[PDB]
Each structure stands twice: as structure tokens, then as C-alpha cells.
DNA sequence: AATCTTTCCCACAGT
DNA sequence: TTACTGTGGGAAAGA
């Protein structure tokens, strides 16, 4: 049972002793008929971060020197569908899933991955489940224009990828890698898609609200790093060939769109790659409104999402899974004096956990799985001599608290979330 | 609403 | 009507 | 010189 001091330890030392992973994948995918399979693309992938990896690996190995590789597993909750094995500076493992797909005999309308993880020598460290996915039939077709799920709002997180005539095996995509766009064959990007607004260049730059279209000039920003490539105007593509029909600016850019983007002060040049590297691309024009492209130049559009997890054994190292994690959405505060309730919206809430409104716990209840409401801890006995200077806000003078979710065994779950004593 | 951002400017071919 | 999705089918360019 | 396998695009039917 986590003691008031060990958690002191921990929040002092976040990055020491926490475990952090993240499962990236796409918001979309296609679905296969009959005996064929669409790969996942980009394939879902999964990074561990945070040194509390190595730590966790330093406790499982003097636990079984006394009584090795840890190997991972991913599947979509479908029974007939075989789960896959995965294969592998503040990144401790990377692994990516490369040949999931999903078939016309699944029904559903949504599907999730899970992901399960386990070492060599059998000890579970257990399952963890990545955001919403939605089948689609195939890349939409619409002109003009209700749903909006198919759209690309600006703002929002995007991969782009390159199939080579859809063979020679490779496919590659946008990511930047030590302050460099490149094309990788086995990671990919995040970037936020912006639309550019006015004011031409460069740094620090104007955006709007809105979905994206075709003819837009557009700004990929790297989530990771905050590098972005230079204003792009983004164009639909049909096999090999630009289209530059006024009449594509009703056309919403949609997930799995082929498309292209070209430079601003030339209409023939475009982003467009080269084995690994990102280049600019000269096409030749056969058209009023068309351009010819190389391979190179075509590239394939996506919204993705990422799902992360946070925890760290704070005692001892547990006997069972840390899996399931808990998330908190948002905090609801209501009354007021001391009495007053706050809660906690969320996923996985299990009897079994305590909210810690800094290093004291708190009186807790329980309502289900996806709420909890408990108690808020009287100011004063929350900061002291021990917390404090971690606690009080060297800007504001209020007291900023992080709230935490621990569990029994001993296992916290940092929420991501501090709260602001003003109420 | 206003970004920061260093542009990389890919070369040229 | 016109248009867009769903399902089926095949060409293409590799192994 | 055929069999097989993802992938994109077109055909037909459906909505
Ligand atoms: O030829 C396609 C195949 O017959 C398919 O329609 C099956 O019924 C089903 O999708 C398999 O799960
Ligand atoms: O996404 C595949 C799924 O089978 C769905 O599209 C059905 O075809 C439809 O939802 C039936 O109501």
C-alpha cells in the first residue's frame, strides 16, 4: 500500500520511475473482401518511453534470479482473427504492426486494437487498448459538401504515406528524424495539418478554422519536434497526374485520398520523395489542369490518433497485470466549503483505486467504470515542509495540485491532470 | 490563432 | 436524376 | 513460364 513519503519520491521524480506507452494508429481502415488482405496503414505502432522501463526490467530480473525479453501481441477483439506478435534517447522499444487487416465476415462498425505485453519469462504486464477505429469500405469519392468524420479539420493530426507502384514491397512515410523530413520505411509521423491563413513566410505564421479542401494552402507541423515543411497547397491526384480543377475547392480532402502538395511560388513543384529523402519534385505540365508526377510525388492522407498510458509500481514490483489502466477525461467541481464533491470522468475506474490530490490521499467512493465521485482534501493538509516548493505556483502564489489514481498493489497512474486551488 | 514553427526547406532533386 | 457507397473483380508489379 | 499476393482503380448494384 502506497505510503504518503514513496509517492513524495515519485512525483519529485516523474521521469525516473514512470512507464509510458503509446499506441499510434489511424483513425480509419479499410476493409478486405473475400480471401484478400488491406493492410493497416500506417501500420499501428507502439513506443515505450520513460527510464521506469529499465527499472522495471532491473525488478523482474532479481525477481526471477531468485524463483528475460519481453514480447508483445496485438489484435482487433475478434476471435477469428489471430492476434499478431509484434517484433522490436528516452524511447526504450519500438515496435510496429505491419500486416493487420480486417475482414468483410467482421461486422462491426467500430473496432479497437489491443495489445498485450508479456516478458520472456511469463510474467504479464498487460493489455492496453488503442482508441476508436472505423471500417470503411473504401476512400471516399464525394465532390462537394451530415457526417464530417471522413473530413480533415485543421489542427488536427494527420500521416502521410507513399506506396510505390502499389509494388515493389515498400511503402514509406513523412517523418522527421534529427531535424530533417524524411521518408521512413518503418516509423511515421504525426503532423498536425493547418490552414495557412494571411498577412510571405515563415516561423510564425497565421491559421483558420475549418476542414480542409483541395486547392488550400496548407502547414504540416511535426507533433515531436515543432519542425514544419514550408506553406504547401494541397491538390487531389488521379494515378500519376495532378487535378486543378477550380471545382476541387468544393472537394473536402478525405482519409485515404491520394494527393500531392505544391510549392507556392511554383505550380510545378512538388513534395515528393527520393528513397529516404524529401525533395522538391518539378513536374511537366499536360494540362491547363492537370500535371504529370512522379511516384514519388503521390502520396496518401490519414487522420490518426494515439493512446497513451501512464503508471509506476511505487512500492514493491506487483503480482498482477497493471493492467487496466485507468483514463480521466475532465473534473466537475460542485458546491462549495469543505463538503463539496468533485468528480472524475473517465474509462477502466476499478474499486481497487484512490485519487491523490498530491502526496495526502482523499476520501473516495465509486460510482462505475467510466465515473467517480470523491471528496476534496481541506487546503491546508495538502502542502507542508516536504511538499510545497513543488505545490505552490511560483508565478500565480495559488496552489496547483497533480492528481494521481493508485491502486492497491501500489501501482500510480499519473492522470496528466493538475488542479487549480481557486473554486 | 498564431504557430511556431522552424520550416525545414527540403532540397532540390 | 444524379451521385456516392458497398461489394466484387481484375491488372499490375513484384516474389 | 505459371502461381500467388497486396494494392489501386473500375464495374455493377445498391441506397
Ligand atoms: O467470395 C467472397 C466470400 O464468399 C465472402 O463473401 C464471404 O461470405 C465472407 O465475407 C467470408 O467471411
Ligand atoms: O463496416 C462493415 C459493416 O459490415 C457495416 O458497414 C455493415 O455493412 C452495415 O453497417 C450493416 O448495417
Known amino acids: 500500500s502506497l505510503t504518503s513519503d514513496r509517492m513524495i519520491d515519485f512525483l519529485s521524480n516523474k521521469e525516473k520511475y514512470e512507464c509510458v506507452i503509446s499506441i499510434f494508429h489511424a483513425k480509419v481502415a479499410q476493409k478486405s473482401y473475400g480471401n484478400e488482405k488491406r493492410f493497416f496503414c500506417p501500420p499501428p505502432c507502439i513506443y515505450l518511453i520513460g527510464q521506469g522501463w529499465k527499472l522495471k526490467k532491473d525488478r523482474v530480473a532479481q525477481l526471477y534470479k531468485t524463483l528475460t525479453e519481453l514480447v508483445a501481441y496485438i489484435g482487433i477483439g475478434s476471435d477469428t482473427s489471430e492476434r499478431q506478435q509484434l517484433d522490436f534517447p528516452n524511447i526504450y522499444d519500438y515496435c510496429a504492426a505491419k500486416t493487420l487487416y480486417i475482414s468483410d465476415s467482421d461486422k462491426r462498425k467500430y473496432f479497437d486494437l489491443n495489445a498485450q505485453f508479456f516478458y520472456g519469462c511469463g510474467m504479464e504486464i498487460g493489455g492496453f487498448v488503442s482508441q476508436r477505429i472505423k471500417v470503411i469500405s473504401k476512400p471516399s469519392k464525394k465532390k462537394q459538401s451530415d457526417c464530417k468524420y471522413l473530413c480533415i479539420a485543421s489542427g488536427t493530426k494527420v500521416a502521410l504515406f507513399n506506396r510505390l507502384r502499389s509494388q515493389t514491397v515498400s511503402t514509406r512515410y513523412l517523418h522527421v528524424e534529427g531535424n530533417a523530413f524524411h521518408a521512413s520505411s518503418t516509423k511515421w509521423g504525426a503532423f498536425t495539418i493547418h490552414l495557412f491563413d494571411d498577412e510571405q513566410e515563415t516561423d510564425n505564421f497565421a491559421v483558420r478554422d475549418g476542414f480542409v479542401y483541395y486547392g488550400s494552402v496548407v502547414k504540416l507541423v511535426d507533433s515531436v519536434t515543432g519542425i514544419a515543411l514550408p506553406r504547401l497547397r494541397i491538390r487531389k491526384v488521379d494515378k500519376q497526374q495532378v487535378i486543378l480543377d477550380a471545382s476541387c475547392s468544393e472537394e473536402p480532402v478525405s482519409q485515404l485520398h491520394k494527393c500531392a502538395f505544391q510549392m507556392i511560388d511554383n505550380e510545378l513543384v512538388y513534395l515528393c520523395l527520393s528513397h529516404d529523402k524529401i525533395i522538391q519534385h518539378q513536374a511537366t505540365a499536360i494540362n491547363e489542369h492537370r500535371h504529370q508526377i512522379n511516384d514519388g510525388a503521390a502520396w496518401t492522407i490519414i487522420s490518426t490518433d494515439k493512446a497513451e498510458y501512464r503508471f509506476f509500481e511505487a512500492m514493491g514490483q506487483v503480482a498482477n497485470p497493471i493492467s487496466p489502466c485507468p483514463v480521466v477525461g475532465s473534473l466537475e467541481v460542485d458546491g462549495h466549503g469543505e463538503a463539496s464533491r468533485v468528480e472524475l470522468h473517465g474509462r477502466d475506474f476499478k474499486p481497487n483505486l484512490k485519487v491523490w490530490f498530491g502526496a495526502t490521499p482523499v476520501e473516495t467512493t465509486f460510482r462505475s467504470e467510466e465515473s467517480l465521485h470523491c471528496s476534496i482534501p481541506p487546503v491546508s493538509q495538502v502542502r507542508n515542509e516536504q511538499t510545497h516548493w513543488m505545490f505552490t505556483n511560483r508565478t500565480t502564489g495559488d496552489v496547483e495540485v497533480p492528481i494521481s489514481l493508485v491502486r492497491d498493489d501500489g501501482v500510480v497512474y499519473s492522470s496528466g491532470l493538475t488542479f487549480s486551488y481557486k473554486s | ?13
Open chain 2, 1 to 13: 490563432r498564431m504557430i511556431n514553427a522552424s520550416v525545414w526547406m527540403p532540397p532540390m532533386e
